[PDB]
Amino acid sequence: QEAQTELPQARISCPEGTNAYRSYCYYFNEDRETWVDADLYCQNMNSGNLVSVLTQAEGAFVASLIKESGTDDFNVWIGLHDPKKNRAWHWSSGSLVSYKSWGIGAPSSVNPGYCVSLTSSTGFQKWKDVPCEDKFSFVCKFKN
Ligand SMILES: *[C@H]1O[C@H](CO[C@]2(C(=O)O)C[C@H](O)[C@@H](NC(C)=O)[C@H]([C@H](O)[C@H](O)CO)O2)[C@@H](O)[C@H](O[C@@H]2O[C@H](CO)[C@H](O)[C@H](O)[C@H]2O)[C@H]1NC(C)=O
8 A cells, every 4th residue: 555656658558569459569570480489489578478369359450460560471370279189279378269260171170280370361360270390470469
């Protein structure tokens, strides 16, 4: 019951290079890393995770962020994976799966991938399952 005052601007605005959407900060990193190594990068900077896409509007924001970067990349990592290889999907942040956006023929049963990327052919709006050892660029999400 000491400092009962209003939030400073650092808790309402996101830092240079990152963009705000509904109380979180987001950024696209063009470094090509495995899914696990990408999630670790996100954890190391302001205690985030690979992005979790929980609504259609959040998916539209993330797609716009990637397009605005000017990247020529085909695949971008998001935080969804199948850890027990039994087609039960989880977000690395622990959030519930409240939204899905699978592309045509996904998730595959005939040549299954266990990690998920956004595809450039769909304007970064639809998802594909791919091997977790692939090296792709990625989007991080962190609270602030
Ligand atoms: C809210 O502000 C607390 C500091 O407040 C003054 C101060 O005494 O320094 C209150 C003054 O009215 C104000 N003066 C003017 C003219 O605005 C100043 C200035 O706003 C400030 O100097 C910037 O120039 O602030 C701030 O430190 C407090 O923080 C927290 O304090 C708690 C401790 O009791 C606990 O440590 C919190 O975890 C910590 O964030 C600020 N509150 C929040 C939620 O950020």
